[PDB]
Design an enzyme around this catalytic site. Structure first.
Site, PDB file in Angstrom:
ATOM      1  N   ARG E 371      18.686   4.341  -1.947  1.00 45.78           N
ATOM      2  CA  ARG E 371      18.459   4.052  -0.534  1.00 45.78           C
ATOM      3  C   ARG E 371      19.477   4.768   0.345  1.00 45.78           C
ATOM      4  O   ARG E 371      19.116   5.348   1.377  1.00 45.78           O
ATOM      5  CB  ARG E 371      18.513   2.544  -0.289  1.00 45.78           C
ATOM      6  CG  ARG E 371      17.166   1.850  -0.380  1.00 45.78           C
ATOM      7  CD  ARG E 371      16.541   2.012  -1.753  1.00 45.78           C
ATOM      8  NE  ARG E 371      15.345   1.188  -1.904  1.00 45.78           N
ATOM      9  CZ  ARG E 371      14.600   1.139  -3.004  1.00 45.78           C
ATOM     10  NH1 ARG E 371      14.924   1.868  -4.064  1.00 45.78           N
ATOM     11  NH2 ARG E 371      13.531   0.357  -3.046  1.00 45.78           N
TER      12      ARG E 371
HETATM   13  N1  LIG Z   1       8.720   8.212   4.173  1.00 52.40           N
HETATM   14  C1  LIG Z   1      10.080   8.077   3.685  1.00 52.40           C
HETATM   15  N2  LIG Z   1      10.901   8.421   4.659  1.00 52.40           N
HETATM   16  C2  LIG Z   1      12.230   8.385   4.465  1.00 52.40           C
HETATM   17  N3  LIG Z   1      12.727   7.996   3.272  1.00 52.40           N
HETATM   18  C3  LIG Z   1      11.892   7.644   2.272  1.00 52.40           C
HETATM   19  C4  LIG Z   1      10.586   7.680   2.463  1.00 52.40           C
HETATM   20  N4  LIG Z   1       9.985   7.283   1.315  1.00 52.40           N
HETATM   21  C5  LIG Z   1      10.938   7.004   0.422  1.00 52.40           C
HETATM   22  N5  LIG Z   1      12.120   7.224   0.999  1.00 52.40           N
HETATM   23  C6  LIG Z   1      12.873   6.896  -0.028  1.00 52.40           C
HETATM   24  O1  LIG Z   1      12.582   5.477  -0.468  1.00 52.40           O
HETATM   25  C7  LIG Z   1      13.732   4.899  -0.671  1.00 52.40           C
HETATM   26  C8  LIG Z   1      13.781   3.625   0.104  1.00 52.40           C
HETATM   27  O2  LIG Z   1      12.712   2.821  -0.256  1.00 52.40           O
HETATM   28  P1  LIG Z   1      12.310   1.582   0.757  1.00 52.40           P
HETATM   29  O3  LIG Z   1      11.584   2.122   1.959  1.00 52.40           O
HETATM   30  O4  LIG Z   1      13.564   0.880   1.205  1.00 52.40           O
HETATM   31  O5  LIG Z   1      11.339   0.528  -0.036  1.00 52.40           O
HETATM   32  P2  LIG Z   1      11.273  -1.067   0.335  1.00 52.40           P
HETATM   33  O6  LIG Z   1      10.358  -1.282   1.511  1.00 52.40           O
HETATM   34  O7  LIG Z   1      10.748  -1.857  -0.849  1.00 52.40           O
HETATM   35  O8  LIG Z   1      12.655  -1.570   0.688  1.00 52.40           O
HETATM   36  C9  LIG Z   1      14.949   5.913  -0.128  1.00 52.40           C
HETATM   37  O9  LIG Z   1      15.770   6.355  -1.265  1.00 52.40           O
HETATM   38  C10 LIG Z   1      14.419   6.899   0.412  1.00 52.40           C
HETATM   39  O10 LIG Z   1      15.096   8.165  -0.074  1.00 52.40           O
END
Ligand SMILES: Nc1ncnc2c1ncn2[C@@H]1O[C@H](COP(=O)(O)OP(=O)(O)O)[C@@H](O)[C@H]1O
Ligand SMILES: Nc1ncnc2c1ncn2[C@@H]1O[C@H](COP(=O)(O)OP(=O)(O)OP(=O)(O)O)[C@@H](O)[C@H]1O
Ligand SMILES: [Mg+2]
Ligand SMILES: [Mg+2]
Lengths: 48, 55, 68, 470, 512
Positions: E371
């Site tokens: 993340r």
């Molecule tokens: N569209 C996106 N835009 C920016 N970062 C993204 C995107 N998709 C994945 N990431 C990646 O996903 C990870 C974060 O996942 P996340 O959105 O927090 O899932 P969740 O909703 O379950 O918390 C990050 O490591 C990030 O690099």
């Protein structure tokens, strides 16, 4: 070329079918084990 | 001539760092033993107290 | 034992290689295709106030001098 | 005066012994002598003046025989504009350290859903700025919206983008209920809304409410904190005919929390260990999130798909209640396309030729059929390749990839990860951009330019720039 | 301080020793079996309270029933008998915390098992405590250098996040943890408190012979001076394995709340679930799916959620968690692994195939994600880390075409070769952590394509020789990259010119 190709696909398709049938058996076996596992869990919870 | 002058120059600093580093380690190393002697002395005091209880 | 991944990689691999060459042709074709008034009034009015002789060539150069 | 008293404490389940006038089910009970305010929700009457309740806070420190007070009403939380721009707890306590919450009155978190005669359903396009969404799965203002995604697929970042694009510039209020998710994301969102001016310390501002039931909270609280946020939206809906934007984080944690205690409650586990009342427990929440004659609620709720198994009972039942669906695919993320919106699985109740313009519906299906054909060709391409295909199939695969890559859109929330500034795409430009590709407007240029672009014009200008560069 | 002054203060301290005893309720055990003790009476007892048996072993009252009380034996239950006495201490479970914990090995309860001497500590914190709220936390913006090239570059770990080391047996799960502890030793020697990271290793359900070997390695490299080892072996009772993770976590909160930085490493949690499942099953509680209790998700979530990055108002401390999960046959769709993945921020997938093919550390970058992302990496790293991911992405695709063969475009041959250099570059031996600045130089040469010249089998040895050459002749360059943490243009030109030059000087296999 076409003669050898046709034979190759026949032998290849033959092997593809045999393997596919074998996995079908294992898939059914895994299906039975899945029902058994989940079913025992439900009975374990219903026992208490 | 410029390669020799820069060699002895940078080499002079390396020797300077070697001495001060040695003089600092020997000092810190001695302090380490000094603290150990102090702890050993006080440890005997605690050992004497425990033995007194047993008696 | 993973044949789905093998087919998946083969798909992306060959497609990338195939379209990678197509990208070159596309860039060349589009590249070959790319290879092949008000300011005039502003300067003219200035030359009018000084009542100096003015020619379109001079105005065009001054206009080009402004853009330069 | 405390009527009840602790009799049994096991895990998060706590039983109270009452002398008379047992409290109704769902009532809130206050335990006296606890270091922190503990609230118990009546759930079952076991007879002999016994009641089984669930603890909202850690049961450590309790003692059998501890007096318990009966409030006579379910858990009541503060409602009104005072909660706007403030973090609140499952029991209504402010955890933002900004002081007590001012509320004109207290409403109960349990209430009956609005009747059917006064449903007043309506369809209205919602321009969210996302081209892939506004085209294939349009959202309806006042209807439920589902974001099905697995672990680490981009559903959390997507919610942030919708807030950045939808919440702001909204005449009505907004509510954010985060249940079961990690607390780190909550602190980030709070600081994000503060920097983005979505929330502020100055009263009369911060037209957005925040509710958090993060993992740090024990079971029972995560299953009822969701109701707290809903009550805030219900207040802004009934008392004022203002459109409310309800951003609900992953809701699977709600049904999951119930199963965490369903066993101790005495229920028999279901096929996948869930409680037998999953449908009813979940149904009571979904039926309450709906538009009525008084006001409308546009709820954006995410559904966590554990192990990427869409056959789980929890999400499977949710599909029936959702108006618009957004299923996230992990395969797209591997390719780098973002947002990883599954074009085939994603559906929208608004995707009807009568509801939306016929042109919008036509371009939508044209893309779906194009991608569906390309997916079938993958099999033969793996063995023979695109070269062995016919000119007709080559063009299908060519445009399909360009359209698929063009679906990727960089947003403001993804700048830190990618480093490219966000971009907003209008509905008109969205339909026109894809409609042109379907006709072959961009079939000439390379597919590399149709990647992470907002409009078709932007991709063409980028393509020409690369030409002069070399 | 003079010896006499210290002795007087020592004697005065011994003088001021208070000891008060109050009436403590006691109860009799109705039954004892499998470590579970049913106690009669013993009312007004708090949940999780500590109780002591006749022999002297402690117990935790978990199940408080109107009829009896369910107590768990915190040790060997051979001496327990029917009717024995059970005395309630009056305090919830807790463990000792402080700086003296570093350099020792404790058990789940906190008793030192090294045999050196008694633990000299005065602060004791409760094992289970509510995690920090939303305000006390803070965004993670500090890198946690593990010493691994692939990790520090592709999956950066920032102090305050939660990364999951998931893999199968003998896949290098423990090797990653060891390399991290060894890397932080350097920062501990130098007087940079802003980068010191106390390491805490929690051993749950592991053979003592292995833990003994683990401690020897730390002492061998002198990395035990800042390491804390909590041991909950298989012979240890299930509650010990159940509390050891939370026990070590409490020790980390000490450094967290004191503005310091601590790294806690939870070993396989599946073993904890077995102990927690065993502890729950023996209590006659209704089992859930896969025989595990219903609140097993709350177990790990409550534990890992405590690790956070405290704000500057509380000292700016941080706690980093690296939980480990062992998979049976690489199936991540199971119940326990799926839950842990959804709780942690990022996860490191270990592949058995990559391990035997020579890819060690066997890291599957395609699935691994974080993340925090580039927010933790340094300036000199983000620039090079970005292009590195893209290059590796393409190589994995062309891997299949290699089998197809029969032709290869000029560019595809380069991209195919270029990617091979990176994979060969990211490889790293065991017990060989690398400095952050050194990785920047090596990773830089790879993306720029200089490694495409020499043969792949020679890239690994070039790494060692190249770094050694830089450390001796070019020392100011390394200092700038370290202090400033950014790769300036002057360094780019200098680095871009010496990398091709060095390859020509040294004796290597230049034929690509
Ligand atoms: N569209 C996106 N835009 C920016 N970062 C993204 C995107 N998709 C994945 N990431 C990646 O996903 C990870 C974060 O996942 P996340 O959105 O927090 O899932 P969740 O909703 O379950 O918390 C990050 O490591 C990030 O690099
Ligand atoms: N990067 C590596 N390079 C070279 N050898 C390695 C590497 N990693 C592991 N090995 C070897 O693998 C064995 C130990 O594997 P390791 O303990 O790291 O994995 P593990 O998953 O933690 O095992 P376990 O589950 O039993 O604790 C040793 O023989 C070690 O030498
Ligand atoms: Mg999420
Ligand atoms: Mg291991």
């Amino acid at each position: 070329e076409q003669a050898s190709r046709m034979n190759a696909m026949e032998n290849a398709s033959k092997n593809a079918g045999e393997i596919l049938s074998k996995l079908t058996l294992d898939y059914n076996k895994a299906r039975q084990a899945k029902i058994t596992m989940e079913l025992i869990e439900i009975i374990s919870g219903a026992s208490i | 001539a410029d390669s020799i002058n820069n060699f002895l120059a940078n080499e002079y600093l390396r020797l300077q760092s070697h001495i001060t580093s040695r003089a600092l380690n020997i000092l810190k190393q001695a302090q380490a033993y000094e603290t150990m002697n102090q702890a050993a002395l006080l440890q005997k005091l605690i050992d004497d107290a425990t033995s007194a209880i047993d008696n | 034992t993973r044949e789905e991944e093998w087919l998946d990689k083969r798909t992306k691999s060959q497609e990338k290689v195939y379209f990678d060459q197509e990208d070159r042709k596309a860039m060349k074709r589009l590249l070959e295709k790319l290879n092949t008034a008000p300011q005039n009034l502003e300067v003219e009015n200035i030359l009018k106030r000084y009542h100096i002789n003015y020619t379109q060539a001079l105005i065009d150069e001054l206009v080009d001098w402004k853009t330069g | 005066k405390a009527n009840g008293q602790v009799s049994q404490v096991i895990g998060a389940v706590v039983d109270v012994q009452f002398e008379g006038e047992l409290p109704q089910i769902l009532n809130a009970l206050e335990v006296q002598g606890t270091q922190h305010r503990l609230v118990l929700e009546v759930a079952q009457h076991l007879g002999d003046s016994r009641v089984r309740t669930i603890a909202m806070d850690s049961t450590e420190g309790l003692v059998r025989g501890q007096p318990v007070v009966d409030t006579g009403l379910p858990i009541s939380v503060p409602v009104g504009p005072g909660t706007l721009g403030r973090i609140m707890n499952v029991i209504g306590e402010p955890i933002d350290q900004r002081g007590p919450i001012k509320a004109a009155k207290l409403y109960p978190i349990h209430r009956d859903a609005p009747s059917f005669t006064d449903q007043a359903t309506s369809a209205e396009i919602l321009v969210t700025g996302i081209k892939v969404v506004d085209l294939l799965a349009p959202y309806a203002r006042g209807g439920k919206i589902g974001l099905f995604g697995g672990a680490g697929v981009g559903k959390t970042v997507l919610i942030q983008e919708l807030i950045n694009n939808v919440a702001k510039h909204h005449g009505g209020y907004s509510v954010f209920a985060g249940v079961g998710e990690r607390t780190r994301e909550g602190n980030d969102l709070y600081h994000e809304m503060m920097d983005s001016k979505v929330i502020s310390v100055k009263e009369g501002e911060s037209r957005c409410a925040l509710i958090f039931g993060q993992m740090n909270e024990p079971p029972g609280a995560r299953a009822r904190v969701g109701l707290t946020g809903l009550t805030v939206a219900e207040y802004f809906r009934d008392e004022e005919g203002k459109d409310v934007l309800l951003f609900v984080d992953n809701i699977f944690r709600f049904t999951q929390a119930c199963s965490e205690v369903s066993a101790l409650l005495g229920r028999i586990p279901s096929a996948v260990g869930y409680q037998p009342t999953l449908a009813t427990d979940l149904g009571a929440l979904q039926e309450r999130i709906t538009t009525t004659q008084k006001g409308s609620i546009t709820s954006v709720q995410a559904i966590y798909v554990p192990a990427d198994d869409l056959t789980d009972p929890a999400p499977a039942t949710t599909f029936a209640h959702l108006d618009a669906t957004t299923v996230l695919n992990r395969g797209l993320t591997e390719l780098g396309i973002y947002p990883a919106v599954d074009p085939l699985d994603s559906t929208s109740r608004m995707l009807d030729p009568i509801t939306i313009g016929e042109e919008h519906y036509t371009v939508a299906r044209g893309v779906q059929k194009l991608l569906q054909d390309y997916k079938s060709l993958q099999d033969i391409i793996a063995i023979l390749g695109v070269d062995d295909l016919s000119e007709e199939d080559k063009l299908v695969v060519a445009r399909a990839r360009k359209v698929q890559k063009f679906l990727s859109q960089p947003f403001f929330m993804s700048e830190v990860f990618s480093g490219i500034p966000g971009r907003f795409v209008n509905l008109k430009q969205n339909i026109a951009s894809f409609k042109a590709l379907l006709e072959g407007a961009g079939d000439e240029y390379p597919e590399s330019c149709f990647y992470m672009k907002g409009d078709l014009e932007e991709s063409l200008a980028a393509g020409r720039a690369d030409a002069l560069k070399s | 301080l003079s010896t006499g002054e210290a002795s007087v203060v020592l004697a005065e301290k011994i003088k001021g020793i208070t000891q008060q005893n109050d009436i403590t309720e006691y109860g009799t055990v109705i039954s004892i079996g499998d470590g579970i003790a049913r106690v009669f009476g013993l009312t007004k007892v708090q949940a999780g309270e500590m109780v002591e048996f006749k022999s002297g072993i402690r117990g935790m009252a978990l199940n408080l029933e109107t009829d009896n009380v369910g107590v768990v034996v915190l040790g060997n239950d051979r001496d327990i008998k029917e009717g024995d006495v059970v005395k309630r201490t009056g305090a919830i479970v807790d463990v000792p915390i402080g700086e003296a914990m570093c350099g020792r090995v404790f058990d789940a309860l906190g008793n030192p098992i090294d045999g050196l001497g008694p633990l000299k500590t005065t602060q004791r914190a409760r094992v289970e405590i509510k995690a920090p709220g939303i305000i006390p936390r803070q965004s993670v913006r500090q890198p946690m250098q593990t010493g691994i090239k692939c990790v520090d570059s592709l999956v950066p770990i920032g102090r305050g996040q939660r990364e999951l080391i998931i893999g199968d047996r003998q896949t290098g799960k423990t090797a990653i943890a060891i390399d991290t502890i060894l890397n932080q030793k350097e920062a501990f020697n130098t007087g940079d408190v802003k980068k010191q990271l106390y390491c805490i290793y929690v051993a749950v359900g592991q053979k003592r012979s292995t833990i003994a070997n683990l401690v020897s390695i730390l002492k061998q490299h002198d990395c035990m001076k800042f390491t804390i080892v909590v041991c909950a072996t298989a012979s240890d009772a299930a509650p010990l394995q159940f509390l050891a993770p939370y026990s070590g976590c409490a020790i980390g909160e000490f450094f967290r709340d004191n503005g310091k930085h601590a790294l806690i490493i939870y070993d396989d949690l599946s073993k904890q679930a077995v102990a927690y499942r065993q502890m729950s099953l023996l209590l006659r509680r209704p089992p859930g799916r896969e025989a595990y209790p219903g609140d097993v998700f709350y177990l790990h979530s409550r534990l890992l959620e405590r690790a956070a990055k405290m704000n500057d108002s509380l000292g700016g401390g941080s706690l980093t968690a690296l939980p480990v999960i062992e998979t049976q046959a690489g199936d991540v769709s199971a119940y326990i692994p799926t839950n842990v993945i959804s709780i942690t921020d990022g996860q490191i997938f270990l592949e058995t195939e990559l391990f035997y093919k020579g890819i060690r550390p066997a890291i599957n970058v395609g699935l691994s994600v974080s993340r925090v992302g580039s927010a933790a990496q340094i300036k000199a790293m983000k620039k090079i880390a970005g292009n590195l991911k893209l290059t590796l992405a393409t190589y994995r695709e062309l891997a299949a075409f290699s089998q197809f063969g029969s032709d290869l475009d000029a560019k595809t041959q380069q991209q195919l070769n270029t990617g091979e250099r990176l994979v060969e570059m990211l490889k790293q031996n065991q017990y060989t952590p690398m400095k952050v600045e050194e990785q920047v130089c090596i990773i830089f040469a790879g993306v720029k394509g200089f490694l495409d010249a020499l043969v792949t089998s020679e890239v690994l040895k070039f790494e060692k020789k190249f770094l050694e050459h830089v450390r001796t002749n070019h020392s100011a360059l390394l200092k700038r990259i370290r202090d400033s943490g950014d790769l300036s243009e002057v360094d780019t030109n200098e680095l871009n010119t010496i990398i091709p030059l060095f390859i020509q000087e040294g004796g290597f296999k230049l034929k690509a």
